[PDB]
């Protein structure tokens, strides 16, 4: 546990603040509740005297002294599909049902826990060398830094927009043209599950091109300039082409008129955003040599795309036999 020793004097305009509130302002490196625990446990002196009432009001000019002490994520046996690894980086093909980094609702079971198990020295790299995210139910490529120099350099490459991250997706609706969504993204004001386009969000740019038309769906490839939470899903939804199977931004599946039983079945069962990180291209953070990796389209999407393709081709003739 780490020994904490801190001194300061309450500023005159802090007159009337609670002891815990005033200490929080003087020492913002330490959480509010932490400071409260320190006070109650007789670890704060005020003018050479122990003061243990967190609610007690300061006057300004009080000399404060604290003498206290302090005290991460666990490795988990979770298999990873490693596409490429060298001394500096790892490229993984992430399956669905796998969160990248611990957060609210997912304390563990994540790619980060998996990395801590596979290569324990990665604990010395910020966020276990994870430099960009994929959603839990998005499949495909991620690059991960194994070392501190590699991580710093990959982060610089992202800031300078020198990493290409391409995805393949199936979107709802007929789309006429490729283009760009450049709309900032924030947390949704009222729906805690959602992100949203919002003037006060973080700037976000997605480029998209049409690979193939289906009857009431469209296959896309996208390239990101930024990697905000849910960026593709929310941008595609914003322009009224939410991703097939998206459980948050999509609505009820709408099959086209006269869709086969197999088409209707495949479409209704598809229970994740039809979204896959398909290609990554970067300058190696150590050698600066240009490199490119591909993750094959997963079977779930292959079946979805083939059914939609057979449907579109069939209904380009008066054929029903």
Q: Residue 218: beta bridge partners?
A: 171, 213
Position 138 contacts Cl ion (CB under 5 A): yes
Position 131 contacts Cl ion (CB under 5 A): no
Contact yes or no for 58/16 (Cβ under 8 A): yes
CB of 22 to Cl ion, least distance (A): 44
Q: How many residues bind Cl ion (CB under 5 A)?
A: 3
Segment lying near Cl ion (by CB under 5 A), choices 72-80, 86-94, 130-138, 145-153: 130-138
Contact yes or no for 314/258 (Cβ under 8 A): no
Segment lying near Cl ion (by CB under 5 A), choices 88-96, 129-137, 257-265, 281-289: 129-137
Residue 250 CA, distance from chain mean position? 19
**Residue 135 or 168 with smaller CB distance to Cl ion:** 135
CB of 248 to Cl ion, least distance (A): 12
Q: Which residue's CB atom is positioned nearest to Cl ion?
A: 138
Residue 135 annotated in active site: yes
Proportion of the chain in helix, strand, coil states, percent, rounded to 5: 25, 30, 45
**Residue 17 or 138 with smaller CB distance to Cl ion:** 138
Catalytic residue, chosen from 20, 41, 52, 135, is 135
**Residue 24 or 280 with smaller CB distance to Cl ion:** 280
CB of 138 to Cl ion, least distance (A): 4
Q: Copy the structure tokens of residue 59.
A: 């006057």
**Residue 98 or 307 with smaller CB distance to Cl ion:** 98
The residue from 134, 141, 195, 274 that contacts Cl ion (CB under 5 A) is: 134
Using CA atoms, how far residue 20 sits from 8, 24, 39, 113, in Å, is 14, 6, 8, 36
CB of 230 to Cl ion, least distance (A): 7
Q: Copy the structure tokens of residue 319.
A: 């054929």
Segment lying near Cl ion (by CB under 5 A), choices 96-104, 138-146, 210-218, 311-319: 138-146
Torsion angle of C-alpha atoms 196, 112, 138, 180, degrees rounded to 10: 50
**Residue 56 or 225 with smaller CB distance to Cl ion:** 225
Using CA atoms, how far residue 201 sits from 33, 98, 167, in Å, is 29, 26, 23
Q: Which residues contact 67 (CB under 8 A, 6 or more apart)?
A: 3, 4, 5, 43, 45
Position 218 contacts Cl ion (CB under 5 A): no
Cα–Cα–Cα angle for 264, 266, 271, rounded to 5 degrees? 115
How far is residue 146's CA from residue 121's CA, in Å, rounded to a whole number?
8
Segment lying near Cl ion (by CB under 5 A), choices 45-53, 127-135, 173-181, 240-248: 127-135
**Residue 117 or 221 with smaller CB distance to Cl ion:** 221
Position 135 contacts Cl ion (CB under 5 A): yes
Binding site for Cl ion (CB under 5 A): 134-135, 138
Catalytic residues: 135
């Amino acid at each position: 546990a780490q020994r904490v020793q801190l001194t300061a004097t309450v500023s005159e305009n802090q007159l009337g603040q609670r002891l815990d509130q005033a200490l929080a302002e003087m020492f913002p490196d330490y959480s509010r509740s932490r400071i409260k625990e320190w006070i109650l446990d007789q670890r704060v002196l005020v003018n050479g005297k122990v003061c243990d009432k967190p609610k007690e009001k300061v006057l300004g000019g009080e000399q404060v002294a604290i003498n206290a002490e302090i005290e991460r994520f666990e490795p988990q046996d979770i298999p990873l599909d490693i596409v490429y690894e060298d001394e500096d980086i790892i490229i993984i093909n992430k399956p669905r049902d796998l969160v990248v980094h611990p957060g609210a609702g997912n304390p563990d079971g994540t790619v980060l826990n998996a990395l801590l198990h596979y290569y324990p020295p990665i604990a010395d790299v910020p966020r276990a060398g994870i430099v960009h995210r994929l959603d839990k139910d998005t499949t495909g490529l991620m690059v991960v830094a194994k070392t501190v120099p590699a991580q710093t350099r990959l982060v610089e490459s992202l800031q300078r927009r020198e990493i290409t991250r391409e995805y393949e997706a199936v979107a709802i609706g007929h789309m006429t043209a490729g283009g760009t969504v450049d709309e900032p993204i924030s947390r949704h004001p009222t729906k805690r599950t959602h992100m949203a386009v919002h003037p006060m969000g973080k700037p976000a740019v997605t480029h998209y091109r049409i690979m193939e038309h289906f009857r009431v769906h469209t296959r896309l490839r996208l390239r990101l300039e930024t990697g905000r939470t849910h960026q593709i899903r929310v941008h595609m939804a914003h322009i009224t082409h939410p991703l097939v199977g998206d459980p948050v931004y999509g609505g009820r599946p709408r099959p086209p008129k006269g869709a086969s039983e197999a088409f209707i079945s495949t479409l209704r069962k598809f229970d994740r955003q039809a979204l896959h990180a398909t290609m990554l291209r970067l300058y190696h953070p150590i050698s600066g040599i240009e490199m490119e990796w591909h993750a094959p389209i997963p079977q779930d999407m292959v079946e979805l795309i083939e059914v939609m393709r057979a449907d579109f081709e069939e209904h380009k003739d008066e054929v029903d036999w």
